[PDB]
Coordinates of C-alpha atoms and ligand atoms in Angstrom, one line a residue:
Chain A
X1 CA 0.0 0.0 0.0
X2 CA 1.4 3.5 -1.0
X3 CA 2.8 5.0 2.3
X4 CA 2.9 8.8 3.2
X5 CA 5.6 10.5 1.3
X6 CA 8.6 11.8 3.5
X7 CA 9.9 15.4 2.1
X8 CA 13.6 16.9 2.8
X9 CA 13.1 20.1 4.7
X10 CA 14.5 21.9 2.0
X11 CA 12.2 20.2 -0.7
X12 CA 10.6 22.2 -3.4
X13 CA 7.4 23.9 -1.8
X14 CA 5.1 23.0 -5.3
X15 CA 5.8 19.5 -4.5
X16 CA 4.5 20.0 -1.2
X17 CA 1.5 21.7 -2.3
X18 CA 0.6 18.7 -5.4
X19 CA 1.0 16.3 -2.3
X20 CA -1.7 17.7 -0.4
X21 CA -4.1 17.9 -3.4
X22 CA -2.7 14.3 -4.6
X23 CA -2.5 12.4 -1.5
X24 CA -3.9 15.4 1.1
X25 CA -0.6 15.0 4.0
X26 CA 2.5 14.6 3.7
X27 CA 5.4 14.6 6.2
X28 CA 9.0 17.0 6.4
X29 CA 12.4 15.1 7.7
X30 CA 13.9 16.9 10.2
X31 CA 12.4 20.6 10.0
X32 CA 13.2 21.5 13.5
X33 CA 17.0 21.2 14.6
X34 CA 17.6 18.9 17.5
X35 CA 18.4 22.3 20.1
X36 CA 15.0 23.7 18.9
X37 CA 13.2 20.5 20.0
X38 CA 15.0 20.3 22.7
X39 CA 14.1 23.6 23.9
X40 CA 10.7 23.4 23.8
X41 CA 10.7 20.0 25.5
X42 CA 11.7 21.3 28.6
X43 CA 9.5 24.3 27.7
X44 CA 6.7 22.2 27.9
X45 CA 8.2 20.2 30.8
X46 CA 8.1 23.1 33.1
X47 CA 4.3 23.8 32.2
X48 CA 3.1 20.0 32.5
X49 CA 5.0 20.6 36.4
X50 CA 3.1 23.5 37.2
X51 CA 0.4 22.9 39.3
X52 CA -3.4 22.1 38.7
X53 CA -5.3 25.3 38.4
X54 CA -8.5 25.3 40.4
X55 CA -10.9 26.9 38.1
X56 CA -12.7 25.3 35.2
X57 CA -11.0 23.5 32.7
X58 CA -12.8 23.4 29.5
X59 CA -11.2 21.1 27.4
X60 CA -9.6 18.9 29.9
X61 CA -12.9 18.8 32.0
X62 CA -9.3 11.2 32.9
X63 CA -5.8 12.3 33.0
X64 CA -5.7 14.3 30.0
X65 CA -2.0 15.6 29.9
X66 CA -2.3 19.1 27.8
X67 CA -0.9 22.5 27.4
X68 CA -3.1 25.2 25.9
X69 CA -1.9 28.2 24.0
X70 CA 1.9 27.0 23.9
X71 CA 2.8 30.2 22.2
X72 CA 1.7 32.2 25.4
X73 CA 4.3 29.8 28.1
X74 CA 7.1 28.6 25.4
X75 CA 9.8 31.2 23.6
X76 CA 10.8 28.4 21.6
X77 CA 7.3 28.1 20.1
X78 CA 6.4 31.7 20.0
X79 CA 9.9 32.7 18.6
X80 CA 10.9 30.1 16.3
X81 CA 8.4 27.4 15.5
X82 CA 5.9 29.6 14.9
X83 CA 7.9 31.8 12.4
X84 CA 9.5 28.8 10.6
X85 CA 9.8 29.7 6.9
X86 CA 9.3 26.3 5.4
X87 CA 6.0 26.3 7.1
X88 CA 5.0 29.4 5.6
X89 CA 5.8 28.7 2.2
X90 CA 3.5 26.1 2.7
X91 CA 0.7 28.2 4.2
X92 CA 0.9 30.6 1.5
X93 CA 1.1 28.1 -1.2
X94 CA -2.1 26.7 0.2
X95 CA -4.2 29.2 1.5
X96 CA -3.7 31.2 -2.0
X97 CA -7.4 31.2 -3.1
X98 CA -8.5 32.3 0.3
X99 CA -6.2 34.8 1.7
X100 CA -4.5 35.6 5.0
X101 CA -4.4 33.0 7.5
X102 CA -3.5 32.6 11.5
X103 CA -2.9 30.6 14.0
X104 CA -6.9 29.3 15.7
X105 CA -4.8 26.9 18.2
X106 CA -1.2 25.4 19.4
X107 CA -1.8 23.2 22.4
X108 CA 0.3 20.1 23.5
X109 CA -1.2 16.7 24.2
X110 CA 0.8 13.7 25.7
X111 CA -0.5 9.8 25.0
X112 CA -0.3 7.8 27.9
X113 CA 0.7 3.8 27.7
X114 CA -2.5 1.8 27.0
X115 CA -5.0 4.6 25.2
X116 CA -7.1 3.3 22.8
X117 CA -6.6 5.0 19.4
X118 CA -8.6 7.8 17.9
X119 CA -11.8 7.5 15.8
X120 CA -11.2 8.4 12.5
X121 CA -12.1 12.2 11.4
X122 CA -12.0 15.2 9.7
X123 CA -10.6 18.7 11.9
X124 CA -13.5 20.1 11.6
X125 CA -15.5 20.3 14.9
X126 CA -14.0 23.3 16.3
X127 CA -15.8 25.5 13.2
X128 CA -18.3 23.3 12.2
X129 CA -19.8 25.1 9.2
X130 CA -16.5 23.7 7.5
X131 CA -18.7 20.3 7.7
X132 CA -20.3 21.9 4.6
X133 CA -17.7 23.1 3.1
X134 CA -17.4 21.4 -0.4
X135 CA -14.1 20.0 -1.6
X136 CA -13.8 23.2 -4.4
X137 CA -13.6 25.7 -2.0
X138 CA -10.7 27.7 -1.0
X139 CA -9.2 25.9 2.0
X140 CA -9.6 27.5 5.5
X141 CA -7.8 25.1 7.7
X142 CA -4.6 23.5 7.6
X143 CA -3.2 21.0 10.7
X144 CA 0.2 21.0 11.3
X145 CA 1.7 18.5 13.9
X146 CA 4.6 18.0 15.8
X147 CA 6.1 14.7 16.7
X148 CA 8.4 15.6 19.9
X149 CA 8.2 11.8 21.0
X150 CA 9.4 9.3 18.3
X151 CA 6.0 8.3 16.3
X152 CA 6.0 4.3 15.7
X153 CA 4.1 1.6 15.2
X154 CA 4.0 0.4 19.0
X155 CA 3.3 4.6 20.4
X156 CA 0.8 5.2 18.3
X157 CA 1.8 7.1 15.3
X158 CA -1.1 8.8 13.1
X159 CA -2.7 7.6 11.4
X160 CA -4.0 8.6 7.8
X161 CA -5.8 7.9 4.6
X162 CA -4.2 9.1 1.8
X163 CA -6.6 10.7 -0.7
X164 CA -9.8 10.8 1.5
X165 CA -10.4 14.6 1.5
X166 CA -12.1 13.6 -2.1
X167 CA -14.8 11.8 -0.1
X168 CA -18.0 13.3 0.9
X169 CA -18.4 11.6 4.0
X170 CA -15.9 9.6 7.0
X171 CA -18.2 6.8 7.4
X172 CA -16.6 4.2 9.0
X173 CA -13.5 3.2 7.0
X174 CA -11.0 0.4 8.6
X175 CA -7.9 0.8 10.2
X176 CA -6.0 -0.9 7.3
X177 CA -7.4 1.9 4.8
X178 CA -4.8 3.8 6.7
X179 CA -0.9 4.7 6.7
X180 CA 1.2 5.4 9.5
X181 CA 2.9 8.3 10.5
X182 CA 5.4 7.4 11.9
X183 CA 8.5 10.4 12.6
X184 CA 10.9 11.5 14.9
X185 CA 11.2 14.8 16.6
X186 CA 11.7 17.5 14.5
X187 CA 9.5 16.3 11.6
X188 CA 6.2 17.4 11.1
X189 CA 3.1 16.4 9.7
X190 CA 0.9 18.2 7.7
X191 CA -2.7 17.5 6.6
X192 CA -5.3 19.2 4.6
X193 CA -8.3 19.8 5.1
X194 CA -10.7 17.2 5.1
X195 CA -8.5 14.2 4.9
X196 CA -9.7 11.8 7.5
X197 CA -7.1 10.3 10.0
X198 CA -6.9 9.4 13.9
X199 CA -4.2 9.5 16.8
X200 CA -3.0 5.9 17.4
X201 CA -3.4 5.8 21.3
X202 CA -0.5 4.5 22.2
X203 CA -0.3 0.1 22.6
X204 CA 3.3 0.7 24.8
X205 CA 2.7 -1.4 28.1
X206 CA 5.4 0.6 29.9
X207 CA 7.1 3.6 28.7
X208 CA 7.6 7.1 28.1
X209 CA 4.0 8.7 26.5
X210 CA 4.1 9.9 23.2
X211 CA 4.0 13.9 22.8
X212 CA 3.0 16.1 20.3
X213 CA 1.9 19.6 19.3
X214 CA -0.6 20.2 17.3
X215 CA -1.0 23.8 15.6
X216 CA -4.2 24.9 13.5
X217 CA -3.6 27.2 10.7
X218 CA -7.5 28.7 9.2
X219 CA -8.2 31.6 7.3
X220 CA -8.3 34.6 9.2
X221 CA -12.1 34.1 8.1
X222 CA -12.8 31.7 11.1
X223 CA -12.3 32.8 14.5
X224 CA -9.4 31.5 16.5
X225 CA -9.9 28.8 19.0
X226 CA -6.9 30.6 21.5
X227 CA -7.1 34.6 21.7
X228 CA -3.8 35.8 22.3
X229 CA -5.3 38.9 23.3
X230 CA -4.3 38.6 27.0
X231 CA -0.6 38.2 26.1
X232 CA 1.3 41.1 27.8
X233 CA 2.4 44.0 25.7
X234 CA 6.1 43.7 26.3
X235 CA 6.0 39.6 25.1
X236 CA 3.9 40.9 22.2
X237 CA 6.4 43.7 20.7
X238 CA 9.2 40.7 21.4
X239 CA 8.0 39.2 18.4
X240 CA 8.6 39.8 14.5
X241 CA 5.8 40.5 12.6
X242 CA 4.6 37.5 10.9
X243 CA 4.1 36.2 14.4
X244 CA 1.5 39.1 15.6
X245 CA -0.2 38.3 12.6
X246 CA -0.7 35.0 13.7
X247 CA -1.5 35.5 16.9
X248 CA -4.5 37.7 16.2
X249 CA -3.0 41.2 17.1
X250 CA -2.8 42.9 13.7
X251 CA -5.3 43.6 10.8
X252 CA -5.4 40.8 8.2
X253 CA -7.0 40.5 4.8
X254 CA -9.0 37.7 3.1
X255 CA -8.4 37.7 -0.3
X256 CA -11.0 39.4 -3.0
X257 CA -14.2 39.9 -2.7
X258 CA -13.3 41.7 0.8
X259 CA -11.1 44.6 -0.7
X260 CA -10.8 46.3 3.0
X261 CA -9.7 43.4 5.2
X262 CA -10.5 42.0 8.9
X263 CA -9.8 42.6 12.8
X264 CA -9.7 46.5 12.2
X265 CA -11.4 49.3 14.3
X266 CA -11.7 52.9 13.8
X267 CA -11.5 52.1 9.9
X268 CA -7.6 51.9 11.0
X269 CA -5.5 49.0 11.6
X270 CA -5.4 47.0 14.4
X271 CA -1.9 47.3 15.4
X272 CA -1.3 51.2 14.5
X273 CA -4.4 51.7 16.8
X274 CA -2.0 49.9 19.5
X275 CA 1.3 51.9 18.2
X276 CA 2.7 48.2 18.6
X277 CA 6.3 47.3 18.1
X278 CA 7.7 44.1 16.9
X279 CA 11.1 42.6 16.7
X280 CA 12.0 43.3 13.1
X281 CA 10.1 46.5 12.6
Chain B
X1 CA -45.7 40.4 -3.3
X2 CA -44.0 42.8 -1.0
X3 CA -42.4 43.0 2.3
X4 CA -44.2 41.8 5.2
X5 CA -44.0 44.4 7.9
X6 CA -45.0 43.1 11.8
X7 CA -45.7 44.3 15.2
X8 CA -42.8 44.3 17.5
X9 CA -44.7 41.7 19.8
X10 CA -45.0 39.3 16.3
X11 CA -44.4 35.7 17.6
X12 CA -40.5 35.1 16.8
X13 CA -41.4 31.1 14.8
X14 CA -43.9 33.6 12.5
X15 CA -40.7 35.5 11.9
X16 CA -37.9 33.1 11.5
X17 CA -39.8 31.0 9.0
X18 CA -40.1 34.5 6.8
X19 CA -36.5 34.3 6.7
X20 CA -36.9 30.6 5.1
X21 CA -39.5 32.1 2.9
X22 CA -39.2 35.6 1.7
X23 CA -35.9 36.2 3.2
X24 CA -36.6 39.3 5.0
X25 CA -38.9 41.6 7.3
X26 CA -39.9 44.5 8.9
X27 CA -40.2 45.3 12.3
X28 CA -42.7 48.2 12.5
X29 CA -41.7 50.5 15.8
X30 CA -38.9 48.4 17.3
X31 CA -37.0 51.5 18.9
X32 CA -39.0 54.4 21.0
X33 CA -38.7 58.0 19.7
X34 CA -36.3 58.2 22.3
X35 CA -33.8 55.8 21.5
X36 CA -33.7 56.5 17.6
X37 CA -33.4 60.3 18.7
X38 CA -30.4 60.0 20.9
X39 CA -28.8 57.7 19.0
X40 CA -29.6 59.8 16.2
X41 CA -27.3 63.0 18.5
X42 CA -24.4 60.9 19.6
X43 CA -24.0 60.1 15.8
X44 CA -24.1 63.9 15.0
X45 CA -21.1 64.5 17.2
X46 CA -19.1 62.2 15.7
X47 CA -20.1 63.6 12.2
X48 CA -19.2 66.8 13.3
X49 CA -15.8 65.7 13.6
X50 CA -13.3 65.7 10.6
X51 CA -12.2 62.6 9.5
X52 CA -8.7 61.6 10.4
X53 CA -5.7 62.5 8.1
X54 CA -4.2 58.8 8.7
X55 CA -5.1 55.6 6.7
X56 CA -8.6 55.1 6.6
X57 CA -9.1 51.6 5.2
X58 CA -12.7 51.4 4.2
X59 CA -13.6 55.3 3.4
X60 CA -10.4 55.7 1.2
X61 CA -11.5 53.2 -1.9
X62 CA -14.9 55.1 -2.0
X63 CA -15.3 58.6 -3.1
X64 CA -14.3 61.5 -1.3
X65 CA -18.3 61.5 -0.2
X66 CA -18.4 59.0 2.1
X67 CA -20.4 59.5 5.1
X68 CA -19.2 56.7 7.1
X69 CA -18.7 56.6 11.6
X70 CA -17.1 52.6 11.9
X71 CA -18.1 50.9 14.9
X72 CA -20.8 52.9 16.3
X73 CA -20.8 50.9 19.7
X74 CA -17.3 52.4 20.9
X75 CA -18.8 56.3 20.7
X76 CA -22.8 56.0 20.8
X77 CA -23.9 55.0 24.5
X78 CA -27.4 54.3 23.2
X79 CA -26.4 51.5 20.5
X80 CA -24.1 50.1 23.0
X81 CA -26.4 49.9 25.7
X82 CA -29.8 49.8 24.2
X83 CA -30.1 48.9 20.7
X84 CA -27.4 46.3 20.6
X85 CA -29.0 44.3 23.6
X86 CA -32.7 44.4 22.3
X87 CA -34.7 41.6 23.3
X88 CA -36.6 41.0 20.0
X89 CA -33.2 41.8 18.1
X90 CA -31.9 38.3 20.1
X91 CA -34.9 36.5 19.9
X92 CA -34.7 36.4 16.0
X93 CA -31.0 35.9 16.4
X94 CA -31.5 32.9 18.9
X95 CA -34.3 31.4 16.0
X96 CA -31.8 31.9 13.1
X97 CA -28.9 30.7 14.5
X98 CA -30.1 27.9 16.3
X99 CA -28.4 25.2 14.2
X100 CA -24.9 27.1 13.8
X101 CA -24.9 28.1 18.0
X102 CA -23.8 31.4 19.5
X103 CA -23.7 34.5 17.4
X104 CA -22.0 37.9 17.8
X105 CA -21.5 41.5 16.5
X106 CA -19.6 41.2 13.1
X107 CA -19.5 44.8 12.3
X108 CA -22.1 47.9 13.3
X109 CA -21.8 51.4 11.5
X110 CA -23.2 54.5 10.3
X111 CA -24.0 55.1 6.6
X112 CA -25.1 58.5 5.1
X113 CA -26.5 58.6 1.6
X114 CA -26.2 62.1 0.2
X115 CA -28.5 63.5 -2.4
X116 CA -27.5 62.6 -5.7
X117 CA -25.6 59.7 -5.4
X118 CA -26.6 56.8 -7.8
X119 CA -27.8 53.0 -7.4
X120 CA -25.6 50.2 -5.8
X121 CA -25.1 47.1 -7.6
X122 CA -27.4 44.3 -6.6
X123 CA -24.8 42.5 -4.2
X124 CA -25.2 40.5 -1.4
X125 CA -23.3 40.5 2.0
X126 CA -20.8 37.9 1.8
X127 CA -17.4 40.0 0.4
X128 CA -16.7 40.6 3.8
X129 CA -15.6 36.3 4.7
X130 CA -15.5 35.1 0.9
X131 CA -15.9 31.6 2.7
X132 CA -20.2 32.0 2.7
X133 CA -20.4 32.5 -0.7
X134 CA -19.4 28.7 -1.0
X135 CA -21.8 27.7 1.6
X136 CA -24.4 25.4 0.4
X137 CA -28.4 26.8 1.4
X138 CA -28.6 23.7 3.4
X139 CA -25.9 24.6 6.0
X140 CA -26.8 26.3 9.0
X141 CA -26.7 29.9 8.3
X142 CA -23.8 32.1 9.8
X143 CA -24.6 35.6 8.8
X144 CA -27.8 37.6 9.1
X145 CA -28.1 41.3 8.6
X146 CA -30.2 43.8 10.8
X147 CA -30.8 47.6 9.5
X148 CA -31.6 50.3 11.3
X149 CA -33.3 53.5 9.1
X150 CA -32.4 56.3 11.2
X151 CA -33.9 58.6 8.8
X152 CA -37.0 58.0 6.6
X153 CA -36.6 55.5 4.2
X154 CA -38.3 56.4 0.4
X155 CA -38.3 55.6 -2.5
X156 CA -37.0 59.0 -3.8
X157 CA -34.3 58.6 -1.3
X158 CA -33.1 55.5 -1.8
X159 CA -35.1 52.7 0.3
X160 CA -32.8 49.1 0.1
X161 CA -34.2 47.2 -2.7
X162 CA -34.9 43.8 -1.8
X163 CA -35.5 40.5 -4.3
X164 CA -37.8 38.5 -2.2
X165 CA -37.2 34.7 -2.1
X166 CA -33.4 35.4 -4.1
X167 CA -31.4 33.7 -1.7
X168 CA -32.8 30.5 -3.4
X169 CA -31.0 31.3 -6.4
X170 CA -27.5 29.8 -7.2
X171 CA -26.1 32.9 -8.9
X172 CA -26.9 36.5 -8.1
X173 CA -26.8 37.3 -12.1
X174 CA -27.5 40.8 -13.0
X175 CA -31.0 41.7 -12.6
X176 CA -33.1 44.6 -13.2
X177 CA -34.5 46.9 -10.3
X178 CA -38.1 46.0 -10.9
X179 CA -37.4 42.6 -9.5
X180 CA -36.8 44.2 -6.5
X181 CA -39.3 45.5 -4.0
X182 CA -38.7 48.7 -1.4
X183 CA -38.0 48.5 2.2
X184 CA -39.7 52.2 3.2
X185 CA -39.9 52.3 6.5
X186 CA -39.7 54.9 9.3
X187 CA -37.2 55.7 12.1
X188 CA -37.6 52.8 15.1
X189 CA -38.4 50.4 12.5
X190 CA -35.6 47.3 11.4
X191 CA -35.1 45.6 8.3
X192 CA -34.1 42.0 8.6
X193 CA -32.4 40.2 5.7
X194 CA -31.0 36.8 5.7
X195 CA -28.2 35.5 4.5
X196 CA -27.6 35.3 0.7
X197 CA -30.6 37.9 -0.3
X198 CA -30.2 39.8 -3.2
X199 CA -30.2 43.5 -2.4
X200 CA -29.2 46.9 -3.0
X201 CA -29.0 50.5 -1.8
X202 CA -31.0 52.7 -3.9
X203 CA -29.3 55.9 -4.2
X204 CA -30.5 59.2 -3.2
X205 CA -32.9 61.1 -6.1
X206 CA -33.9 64.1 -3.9
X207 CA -32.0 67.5 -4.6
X208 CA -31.8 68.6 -1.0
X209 CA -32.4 68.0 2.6
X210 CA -31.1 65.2 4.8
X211 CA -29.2 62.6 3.7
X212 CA -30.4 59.0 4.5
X213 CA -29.4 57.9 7.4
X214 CA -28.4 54.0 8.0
X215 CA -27.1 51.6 10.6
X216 CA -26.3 48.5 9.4
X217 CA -25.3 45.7 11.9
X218 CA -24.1 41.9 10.7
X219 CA -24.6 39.4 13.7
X220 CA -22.8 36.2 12.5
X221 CA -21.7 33.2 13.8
X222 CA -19.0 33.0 16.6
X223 CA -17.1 30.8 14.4
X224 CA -16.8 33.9 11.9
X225 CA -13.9 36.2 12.8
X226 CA -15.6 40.0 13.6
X227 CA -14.8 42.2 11.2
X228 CA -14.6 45.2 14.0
X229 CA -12.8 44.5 16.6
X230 CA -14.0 45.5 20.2
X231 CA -10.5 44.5 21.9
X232 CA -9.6 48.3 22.6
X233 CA -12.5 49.3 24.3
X234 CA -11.8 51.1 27.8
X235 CA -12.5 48.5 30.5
X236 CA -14.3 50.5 32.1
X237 CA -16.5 50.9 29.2
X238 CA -16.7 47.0 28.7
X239 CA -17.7 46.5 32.5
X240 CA -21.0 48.9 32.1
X241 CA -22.4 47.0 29.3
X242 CA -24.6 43.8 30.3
X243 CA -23.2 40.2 30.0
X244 CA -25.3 39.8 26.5
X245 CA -23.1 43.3 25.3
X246 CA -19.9 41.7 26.2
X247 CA -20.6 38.8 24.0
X248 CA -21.5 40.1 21.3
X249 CA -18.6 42.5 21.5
X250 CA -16.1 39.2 21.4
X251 CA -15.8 40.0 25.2
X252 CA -16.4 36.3 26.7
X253 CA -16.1 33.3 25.6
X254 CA -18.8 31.9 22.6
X255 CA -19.9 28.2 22.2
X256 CA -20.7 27.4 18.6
X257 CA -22.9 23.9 18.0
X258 CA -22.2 20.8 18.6
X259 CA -19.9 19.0 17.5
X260 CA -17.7 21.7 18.7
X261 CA -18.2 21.0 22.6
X262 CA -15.5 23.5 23.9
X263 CA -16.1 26.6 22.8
X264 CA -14.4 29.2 21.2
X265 CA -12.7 32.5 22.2
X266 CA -11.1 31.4 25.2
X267 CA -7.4 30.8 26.6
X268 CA -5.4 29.1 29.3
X269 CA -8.3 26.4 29.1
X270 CA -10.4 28.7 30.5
X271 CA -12.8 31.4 29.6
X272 CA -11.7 35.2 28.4
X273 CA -14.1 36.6 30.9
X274 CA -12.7 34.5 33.9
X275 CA -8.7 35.2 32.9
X276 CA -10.1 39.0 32.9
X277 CA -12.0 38.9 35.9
X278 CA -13.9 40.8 34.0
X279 CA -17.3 42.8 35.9
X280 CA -20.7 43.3 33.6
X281 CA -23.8 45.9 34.8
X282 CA -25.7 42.9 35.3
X283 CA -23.0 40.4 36.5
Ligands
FE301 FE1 -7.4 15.3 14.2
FE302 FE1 -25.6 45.0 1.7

C-alpha cells in the first residue's frame, strides 16, 4: 500500500503543495533542529510541572495531559516554530485562493501507555460550518503537527488515509485503509483539510507517553480557538511581525471579494491603533 | 408580493420561517422615539468631527463623499447599551442561529447617503468572509443582517431594494430593479435580511435636505472572525455594558454547535471573561 511521502526540509514547496491535493498530507524530515526541540521540550516540561489550576477546565474537563496556547508559556514556540519559513511557504502556497491566515490553536497533548486510538475524522468540529464546506472551495484550515516523542508503530503514530479529503463523508473506514505516520522529533506532519485520519493511542505497556503539538492554521475568516489577546504588551512587541499576525494582534485581509480586510477598528489598523512594536520592525 | 412588515410583539417562529421564505422583514416601531433620537445626536457629534488624516481603510476606496462613523458601539452610549441588547433583536438571532450556535456582533456602522448619489449594484453580504459565498443553502446559516433606518426611508431617497425569495438562487446574475421590491420604512423600524438575499442600496434622487441615514449591523456566527474588533475598548466601558453586550462584542467566551463541545474565544483552558475577571452591569 502506497505510504505517506517523507519530504527533505528543503524540498521544493510545489511539490508539497501537489502532495496535499494528490495524497492530502505529507510529512517533512527533520524541520526542527535537535536544540529547537530540545528547547521546547523542557519548555513544555516546566508547564506540565506546574500545578493544577482550580478553576474550570474546559477542554480537559481522565488524565488528559495538555498544554493550551503553547505560544503564550514557550519562547521556543512563539519565537521560532511559529515563524518557521518552510512552514509558511507552505501556508501561502495553500491558502492562496482564500487569503491571509492565523494561527486558531497550538496546544500540546501527551499519550499515555494503553489509550485506545482515535476514531477516525476530519478537523473540523471546532468550526463546524466547514462540515459543509465542499471540496472546491478555497481551503480554511490546515493542521500542522509536531512529533516531539518518536512516532512508531508500538506509540501510536497517526494515522491517515491518503486521498480521503475527495470523499464526501468519513463513514466508518478500517484501520487498514490507513498509513502510518510514523517520525521523529523535529518532523512534522501536515494534513489538509478534510482528509480523514486518527491519533493511534499509544499500545506501549510501559514507557515514556508519546508527545505532540498540534497547531491549526485557518483563514483569518474563522475565528481563533486561543485569543492571544491577554498576552502582555512587552511579550507581544518581542515578536517579528509575521508572528502578531498569527496571533491575532494585527489587521489581516481575506483575499478578493473583501477589498478592505478583517480585525480592524476605527477604519484603522489593528496594530497602528495599538502603536505596537515588533522585533524586526 | 412585497415586504411583510410586523408588530414588534410578532411571535418570533412567524418570523424566523419569513426568513426561510421571503428572506426578509420589517419590524414596524422596534425602537422608541427616544432611543432613535439619541442615537440619532451621539451620531451627529461624531459627524461633526473631521475625519482623520491617517489611513482610513474602508472610506479611502470610495469617493471623497463618504459619510461613514465605523463601529458605532465604541462612541454612541445608546447603541451600545440599548439597541445592541434588544430583546426582540436576540430572539430572532436565537431562532436563526439555532443550528450554527452562538452569534456575535460582526461589524455595526453608520452610513449617510447624500443626495445625488446613484444606485448600488445588486450585491449580497458575503465579500466581507468570501468563505459564505461557497456555503451550500442547506448549511446552517452564519450571517444575518439587521438595519436600522435612522432617517426616513423612500423611494425617492433611496429605500434598500430587496429580491424576495433570491437567496434561493444559485447565482446572483445581474437583474433589473423592478425585480426588486422597497424597504420604506420609518425611524424605530428594522429591516431583517438573511443571509444570501439579493439586495441593494438605492441611491438618493432628492435635490436637497437630509441625507439618508443607516445603521447597518451583521450578527454572525462566533465561528466567523468579527470584522470590527471591540479588543480596545476602555475597560471601564466593557464592564458597564450587560453580560449579552460583552458577547457580542467578542468579550467572553462563545460556544458554537455541537460537535464543537469546547467553545471558542477562550485561553489558558479557560474562559476570556474568567482570565479578565472581568465585571458586567448585570453580572
Ligand atoms: Fe485530528
Ligand atoms: Fe448589503
Amino acid at each position: 500500500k502506497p505510504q505517506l511521502q517523507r519530504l527533505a526540509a528543503d524540498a521544493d514547496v510545489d511539490r508539497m503543495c501537489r502532495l496535499l491535493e494528490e495524497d492530502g498530507a505529507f510529512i517533512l524530515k527533520g524541520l526542527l533542529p535537535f536544540d529547537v526541540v530540545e528547547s521546547f521540550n523542557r519548555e513544555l516540561d516546566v508547564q506540565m510541572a506546574i500545578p493544577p489550576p482550580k478553576g474550570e477546565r474546559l477542554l480537559a474537563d481522565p488524565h488528559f495531559k495538555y498544554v493550551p496556547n503553547v505560544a503564550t508559556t514557550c519562547p521556543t514556540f512563539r519565537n521560532t516554530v511559529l515563524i518557521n519559513p518552510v512552514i509558511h511557504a507552505i501556508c501561502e502556497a495553500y491558502f492562496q485562493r482564500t487569503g491571509d491566515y492565523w494561527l486558531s490553536a497550538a496546544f500540546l497533548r501527551e499519550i499515555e501507555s494503553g489509550m485506545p486510538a482515535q476514531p477516525f475524522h476530519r478537523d473540523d468540529a471546532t468550526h463546524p460550518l466547514m462540515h459543509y464546506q465542499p471540496l472546491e472551495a478555497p481551503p480554511v484550515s490546515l493542521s500542522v503537527i509536531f512529533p516531539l516523542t518518536e512516532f512508531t508503530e508500538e506509540n501510536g503514530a497517526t494515522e491517515v488515509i491518503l486521498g480521503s479529503h475527495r470523499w464526501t463523508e468519513v463513514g466508518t473506514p478500517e484501520r487498514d485503509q490507513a498509513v502510518l505516520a510514523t517520525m521523529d522529533p523535529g518532523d512534522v506532519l501536515i494534513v489538509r483539510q478534510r482528509v480523514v485520519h486518527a491519533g493511534g493511542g499509544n499500545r506501549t505497556t510501559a514507557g515514556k507517553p508519546r508527545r505532540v503539538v498540534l497547531a491549526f492554521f485557518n483563514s483569518v475568516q474563522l475565528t481563533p480557538f486561543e485569543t492571544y489577546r491577554t498576552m502582555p504588551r512587552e511579550m507581544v512587541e518581542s515578536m517579528t511581525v509575521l508572528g502578531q499576525r498569527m496571533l491575532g494582534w494585527r489587521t489581516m485581509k481575506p483575499s478578493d471579494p473583501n477589498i478592505v480586510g478583517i480585525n480592524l477598528i476605527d477604519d484603522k489598523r489593528l496594530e497602528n491603533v495599538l502603536q505596537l512594536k515588533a522585533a524586526d520592525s
